[PDB]
Every structure is written in C-alpha cells, then in structure tokens.
C-alpha cells in the first residue's frame, strides 16, 4: 500500500554484503603513535564567535567567517590579514574558498550565499552575485568551478547554482531533515550531504538524483568530509561519534568514538594521506583519529570554547581550526 | 631583517585590518541585541520600530537591534545557539487565540502551542540567564471573545470569573509558571494592542532592569 516491502529488501541486500570489518584488515597496520601537534600560528581580529573555515588551493590562504558580520582571508605563513569583508547579513554560518582563489562564498541564517569576487580591477571584495532562492538558513556553500557552486540549506534542499545566471541548475530534495554540511568529491562530479535526519545521501551533480543513502548515525549530522581517494567520506553528528562511509559499499566500515567523549562533533576533515581524521568536538578540543586503526593519535586543545571549524591544507602540511573563542590556530 | 619590503607592507595591511575589525567590534558592542519570538508579531514590530529579519530602533538614548527569527520553519536546535548573549527575549502571544486550533483537524490549540514554545525557549540551555519580555497581544479581541465564549474551553480546569481582568491574570500566571528557573531570570509581562509607543517604554524599562540586575550580580549586591 505504501511500499512496505521495498524498505526491507534494501536492508537485506546491504546486510548480505558484510564479509569482514575494517578493524580486521587494519590489525597488521603499525600504529601511527602520538602526534606532537603544536600551535604554530595564531589568528585573531574578529571578536565574535567563528563558525566557518576553509583552506585555499595554494595551501597558504584560508578564509574564516565570524558572527560579527566579517569573513577574513588569512595569510597562513605570516598570519597577515589579506581581506576583511563586511557582511550585510551577520548571521554567517558557512564560508568557502574557490579553487582558483578568485571567488569566496558565505551563508548564514539568511537565505542567500553571496558570491564575493576577490580578483577585481577595482581591487575590493564586492558582491558579485547573490544566490537567493532558499527558504531556510544556508548550512554550507562549496564551489565546484569559477561559475558553479553547490549550496546546502536548512530547508532540506541542496541547490546547484550557476553564478552567472544566478539560478539553481539542479535542486536536491531527497533529504527529509535539514542538511547541515556539504562535502565535494575530488573529481567534483558528485557530492555528499549530511542532514539532521541522522543520514547522508550521495548526490550526482550532472544528473541530479540521489545515488546512495547512509543512516548509521543516531542524531543530527553536523559535518562531512570526503576521503582523499574519493571512494569514501566521513560524517560527524551530535552522537559524539564520527563514522566512515564508502560509496562503493554503502556501509559504515568503522566508527570513531570514545567513552569519555559525550558531546557532539562540530567539524571533520581528512589529512592528505587520509590516515588521520581531524574532528572538532564541543569539549573545546580536536581529536586526531587513526583512520585505519580507529585510535586517537593526538589531541589539539588549543581553545577555550567549542571548536567550530577546521580543515587541512591541499598539501597536507598544516591543519587550521576555529572555535567560538574567536581564535583560529594553525597546527603542524 | 627577516622580512622583505612586501612582507612589511603586508604586515602593515594586516594590522590596519585588525584595527578596523576592533573598531567594528567596539561599535557593535554598544548595541542592545534582542531576540523576538511568537501572535501579533507584525503589530508589535510596527509599534516598536524569508530569513532572519533585523530591525534597528533608537529609544531614549539607547540603541536596540531586534532579531525576528520568524519564517525559519527549519529545526531551531541547530541555530538557536547563534543568539547567545542577547540582553532579553521578546515573546509575543495573542490572548484572543485561546479559541483557535491551528487547523490540522484541531490536533492542537494555538494558546497551548504558544506556551509550549515559551517553555521550550525559557528552559533552553543557551538562555539559562536571559530575561524574557513577554507581550500578551490582542487584548481587545480577547475581551470581545470572552464576553461570549468563555476561556474555560481553552483551560478546562479553570473555574473562575469570565471578566477580562481575571482571565488575563490567570493567563499571565500560567505563562509565568512555565519558568523552571524563576530565580535566575525574570519575566516582564505586558499587555499590548491598546498602547502607543509606551510598549517601547516597557521594553526599555525591562532592558534597563535586566542590565542593572546583571551589573549587581557582578558585584554581589543582587
């Protein structure tokens, strides 16, 4: 009457594929050991709570967004502020850096992810195009090219935007709950999104249909990051745990959790080799997880408030982390 | 020595941007940020002045910036925390709505839903020490309606006089009873839709009292 039998068939089919857990395969892998992560560069200047951080392609420029209506682009090596943009909507909750480094996007509790053009003959960061069309707050806006950007909004819909046209190229509405985070695959042909329904779905950019769904989490998913190989991605939720999902298996291989960790996860990122999972927690600390053996290889406390954002460079040399304490600290 | 000419210029630019950011933060520090919730919200906003609506109004040498978070049907457990540090919360409820059921085959009563929202926000972990400026709107319609249809339908266990004063007092007491942390925060209740800018006067007085009490809680005199 209402597709009762269909749900069980998928469950049985996915169950039949379980042969060996990821833990068994990684038993012979030598432990990474304690990582002597130490703060190297400290960034300050936006007083309000920092909510979003993203590295540039050059691995030296990163963009941060704060609740004081300011997004700051930082020179990672020298800590020099290169740009400070006054946001008309001060409730920014996400930001991104274009692959070419020419454009920057940010979104908040408003229903717009304004596109900022860094490279202008007038030499100022002016609003290029406003991607209005959402009914809820924007959770994450990640660029595909200089003209295409994918946006995640609290209205449960993800929209592909053509910057020049300013209209949604493709709308994804498969999520029942609000989508909180957006992660792009290395090839950019597909992306995955996490939602408050404790599930994540695989989206194909060029066609616009869900290809896979993941439901291992118990609570709202907050952050997601693609594994560097592109065949897997990690999820972070309010369960105080993060999970690894593989696109070719549709199953969770392993979970990253500890007994003494009870608060939710706000951020997640991978190292260039993919052996380390950079996860930001609400206990003011970041835990480095051995992606293979699923063990804590290090801890970055660094902050006096909740870790709100973090990311690894394209070169994989340094990891930046932001927190509601209004500071971003870069570690190596 | 270790920095080149371009490095020196970049450092100068960085410290200039830092100065500008600090100036902007100082300017924003002297702004009273208020959270608005609700039910006569449009009338309240008109008398005070698809995402978050921000309104700025200056009253008696003080700056108020009100954040109406309406039209955000999305789950607020993921963005309610963005409003930490707000001086006070303005909650709007229409008294005349005791006889409405919000359609949906009358699955709920509008007043009951309003008080459920009030309880959820008051007991929220992010506002354990935030005052609430409660507004009871549509008093004239409430009187006109109770003159014919008793409020007992909305409150089956309420047995008392149907006059406006008693019903309004009972509703105000019911709203205040939702406060499970009454010691930490107060609830300033006012009746509107029959009052001119003096609603702004009530808001200003409540904010002033909240500020004074917060200052005292610093010294230990309150």
């Amino acid at each position, epitope marked *: 009457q209402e597709a009762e039998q269909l749900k069980n068939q998928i469950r049985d089919a996915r169950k039949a594929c379980a042969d060996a857990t990821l833990s068994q395969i990684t038993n012979n892998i030598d432990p990474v050991g304690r990582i002597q992560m130490r703060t190297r560069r400290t960034l300050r200047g936006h007083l309000a709570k920092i909510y979003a951080m993203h590295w540039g392609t050059d691995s*030296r420029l990163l963009v941060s967004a704060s609740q004081d209506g300011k997004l700051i682009i930082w020179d990672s*090596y020298t800590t020099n502020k290169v740009h400070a943009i006054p946001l008309r909507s001060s409730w920014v909750m996400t930001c991104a850096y274009a692959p070419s480094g020419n454009y920057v996007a940010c979104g908040g509790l408003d229903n717009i992810c304004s596109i900022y053009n860094l490279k202008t003959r007038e030499g100022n960061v002016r609003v290029s195009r406003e991607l209005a069309g959402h009914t809820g707050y924007l959770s994450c806006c990640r660029f595909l090219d200089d003209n295409q950007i994918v946006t995640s909004s609290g209205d449960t819909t993800c929209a592909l935007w053509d910057i020049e046209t300013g209209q949604q190229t493709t709308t994804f509405t498969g999520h029942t709950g609000d989508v909180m985070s957006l992660s792009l695959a290395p090839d950019t042909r597909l992306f995955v999104s996490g939602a408050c329904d404790a599930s994540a779905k695989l989206w194909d950019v060029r066609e616009g249909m869900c290809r896979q769904t993941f439901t291992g989490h118990e609570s709202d998913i907050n952050a997601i990051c693609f594994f560097p190989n592109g065949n897997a991605f990690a999820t972070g939720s309010d369960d105080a745990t993060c999970r690894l999902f593989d696109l070719r298996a549709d199953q969770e291989l392993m979970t990253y959790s500890h007994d003494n960790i009870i608060c939710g996860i706000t951020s997640v990122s991978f190292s260039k080799s993919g052996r380390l999972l950079l996860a930001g927690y609400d206990d003011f600390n970041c835990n480095v997880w051995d992606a293979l053996k699923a063990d804590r290889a290090g801890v970055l406390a660094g902050h006096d408030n909740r870790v709100s954002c973090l990311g690894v460079t394209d070169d994989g040399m340094a990891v930046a982390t932001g927190s509601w304490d209004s500071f971003l600290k870069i570690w190596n | 020595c270790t920095l080149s*000419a371009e490095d020196k*210029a970049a450092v100068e*630019r960085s410290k*200039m941007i830092d100065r500008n950011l600090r100036e902007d933060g100082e300017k924003a520090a002297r702004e009273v940020k208020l959270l608005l919730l609700g039910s006569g919200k449009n009338t309240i906003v008109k008398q005070m002045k698809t995402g978050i609506v921000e309104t700025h109004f200056t009253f008696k040498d003080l700056h108020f910036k009100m954040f109406d978070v309406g039209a955000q049907r999305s789950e607020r457990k993921k963005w309610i925390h963005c409003f930490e540090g707000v001086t006070a919360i303005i909650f709007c409820v229409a008294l005349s709505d005791y006889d409405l059921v919000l359609a949906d085959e009358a699955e709920m009563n509008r007043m009951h839903a309003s008080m459920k929202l009030f309880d959820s926000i008051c007991n929220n972990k992010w506002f354990t020490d935030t005052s609430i400026i409660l507004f009871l709107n549509k008093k004239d319609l409430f009187e006109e309606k109770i003159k014919k249809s008793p409020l007992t339908i909305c409150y089956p266990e309420y047995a008392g006089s149907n006059t406006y004063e008693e019903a309004a007092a009972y509703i105000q007491c019911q709203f205040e009873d939702l406060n499970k942390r009454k010691d930490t925060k107060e609830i300033y209740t006012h009746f509107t839709c029959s009052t001119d800018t003096k609603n702004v006067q009530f808001v200003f007085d409540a904010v002033t009292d909240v500020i004074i009490k917060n200052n005292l809680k610093d010294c230990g005199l309150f």
Partner: single-chain antibody
Amino acid sequence: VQLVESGGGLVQPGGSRKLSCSASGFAFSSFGMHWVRQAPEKGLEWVAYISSGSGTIYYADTVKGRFTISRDDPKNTLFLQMTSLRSEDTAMYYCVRSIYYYGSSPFDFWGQGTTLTVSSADIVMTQATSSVPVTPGESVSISCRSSKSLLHSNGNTYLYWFLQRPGQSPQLLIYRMSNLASGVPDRFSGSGSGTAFTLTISRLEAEDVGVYYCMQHLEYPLTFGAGTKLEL
C-alpha cells in the same frame, strides 16, 4: 580602474611643484602608491613610496628629503610634494598602485603619468642588450642580471618584468619570476636562476614591440635597468 596624474608643466630650477593623481574605479585606501620617473630617452627610476594609512613612507636617496609623499584616503587622491627642483629632476612621473599579500600582483596597474620639464648597497639591475631587432611570429628572448641574489629566504624570487609600448605606460608581465600578470597574453614566460633571469616570448606579435624593463623587489631601493627595445 583608472589613474590620472596632474600638475605637470615647466618649472624653473629651485621651484616647488606638487603632482596630484586622482584615483577612480578602485579602492585607493587599500592599495599602496609608488612614483616611478622616466627621463626623456632614458630608463625608469623609482622615486618614492607611500603605504596605506601613511604608516610606511620611503624615498630614493637622490630624492629623499626634497620630495615628500602624502595620501588623502577620503578624497581618493595622491600628492607628491616636490621642492628645489634640479635639472636631473626633468622627467615624467608614473603613478603605480600595488597591494601586498600572498597571491597578489604588485604594480599591476600603471597610470599615464605627468610630464615635468625642469630647466650604496643598492642592487644594480642590468639587461643584456639595449635593443634587439625582431620579426613577428618568431621566438624572442630578453635577459637581465642582478648584482645580488633576489631569492629571498622565504623562497620567493622578487623579480619584476614590465613592457612599455611606444606612447604607452608600462604594463606588468611577470612579478615574481614565475607568474604571469593578469590580463596579459600567455605567450610571455618567465624563468631564471637566483641571479640570472630571462624574459622570453614564445611567438612575437605586432603589439609586443617596445622597451622591456626589469626590477627587483627584494629591497626598497628599487633599480630599473636601461631597458631592452624591441624593433620589428
């Protein structure tokens, strides 16, 4: 973006004249400003620098003291006070805007300049040939040398290449020896060692003819070579 200079004219020796440049179409406050002179039938020479906010001000040894530079951010105009003009000061000054941050392109825009008719550890930049006859469609190479290693400890080689076509202001081509300037044909390429550098054109075009200039930004006493004049 557009920079218009003013105040040019004939001034007798010992007089004082102020050159004013108007900034329109870009954020004047964000960009620092430079003054580069060009004596008639001669090469370029850096004059003075003023940073955003007037925090940092520098002058060349031959002009230090006599010439002072001030900025007016509210009005988006630049002033360069000049006192006790000498016969050597007879040159046309070109105002240049630069912004300093990783990935930036300093000296990316040059103004028309203002014509003025009057009457030590510094790195010396030399170019291999003052003039070179060339033909369209064939590869062309221009080489220059520096008396000191321009490769700073940070790992960036501060080499700048410029092209000044006849009856036109210089146009930036290469700013750090490896990066092509914005709005320039991809034909131009930059390469070199820590002290020897070469500017090569994969295939010459009619618009490439002109005088090419080299500069180092390792230290503020900027030095401009005699130039390399290409003739078709």
